From a paper:
Here, we explore the precise structural inhibitory mechanism of actinonin, which is a slow, tight-binding inhibitor of peptide deformylase (PDF), a metal cation-dependent enzyme. PDF is the first enzyme in the N-terminal methionine excision pathway, an essential and ubiquitous process that contributes to the diversity of N-terminal amino acids. The function of the active-site metal is to activate the reactive water molecule involved in peptide hydrolysis. Actinonin is a natural product with antibiotic activity that inhibits PDF by mimicking the structure of its natural substrates (nascent peptide chains starting with Fo-Met-Aaa, where Fo is a formyl group and Aaa is any amino acid) in their transition state.
Binding of actinonin resulted in a tightening of the active site through the collective closure of the entire N-terminal portion of the protein (strands β1, β2, and β3; helix α1; and CD-loop, see Movies S1 and S2, Figure 1C, and Figure S1). This collective movement involved the formation of a “super β-sheet” as the result of the large rearrangement of β-strands 4 and 5 relative to the rest of the structure in which actinonin forms an additional strand bridging the two β-sheets (β1 andβ2) on either side of the active site. Hydrogen bonding was also conserved, especially the bond between the backbone nitrogen of Ile42 (corresponding to Ile44 in EcPDF) and the alkyl carbonyl chain of actinonin, which potently contributes to the formation of the super β-sheet (see also below). Between the open and closed states, the side chains of Ile42, Phe58, and Ile130 underwent significant structural changes, corresponding to a hydophobic pocket rearrangement, with Ile42 being the most affected. The C state is ultimately locked by the super-β-sheet hydrogen bonds extending across the ligand, including those involving Ile42.
Residue numbers in the entry: 1 to 180
The structure:
């Protein structure tokens, strides 16, 4: 069973609206949470497990029997804060790579829950940091796309190692290259 790693194109592909809110959905959500707990993550998005659908799960505590198991399908940011804050992010699709990303502090979101119920929440602190990370995923935006040029530099070679890994595995050239 498998986390999709950069530079896999799955991570860049358009993700479908979810229309159907059934048990398969609940089983998917549940697989995702368990992937998160196994890999010590604090969120996951559907493309990261091979599925180009608009679905994210997160839990800010990142620990069993802690925090909240938050689910969001078909979300859309209605607004970002003006205030920006730094935070060191890693990503399960880029194993071992950690670097500063600056993002809005809070967001207003419109999203659906696991049954189909549309709602409207605000987020700040870690929940908004995780959300935005995962929402980028839903839009085929990766964390290094959001990194300043000096920060991207410090991880270039680490990204290329992932590029190489994918080339060695597939026999194909990487479909994208941080050298940009
Ligand atoms: C920070 C914003 C949300 C991060 C989400 C990722 C998981 C992921 O890639 N989701 O798309 C994660 O859990 N990353 C972890 C991460 O960045 N963490 C773990 C808790 C604190 C923070 C490191 O500052 C580790 C696994 C790299
Ligand atoms: Zn489970
Ligand atoms: Zn579980
Ligand atoms: Zn832990
Ligand atoms: Zn990620
Ligand atoms: Zn190079």
């Amino acid at each position: 069973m498998e986390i999709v790693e950069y530079p896999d194109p799955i991570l860049r592909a358009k993700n479908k609206r979810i229309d159907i809110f059934d048990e398969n959905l609940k089983n998917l959500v549940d697989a995702m949470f368990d992937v998160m707990y196994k890999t010590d993550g604090i969120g996951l998005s559907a493309p990261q497990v091979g599925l180009n659908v608009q679905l994210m799960v997160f839990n800010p505590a990142g620990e069993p029997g802690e925090g909240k198991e938050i689910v969001l399908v078909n979300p859309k940011i209605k607004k970002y804060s003006d205030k920006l804050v730094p935070f060191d992010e890693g990503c399960l699709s880029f194993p071992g790579i950690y670097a500063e990303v600056v993002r809005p502090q809070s967001v207003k979101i419109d999203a659906r829950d696991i049954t189909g119920e549309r709602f409207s929440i605000s987020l700040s602190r870690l929940p908004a940091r995780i959300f935005q990370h995962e929402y980028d995923h839903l839009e085929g935006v990766l964390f290094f796309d959001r990194m300043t040029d000096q920060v991207l530099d410090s991880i270039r070679e680490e990204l290329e190692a992932l590029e190489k890994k994918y080339e060695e595995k597939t026999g194909l050239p990487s479909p994208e290259r941080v050298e940009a």
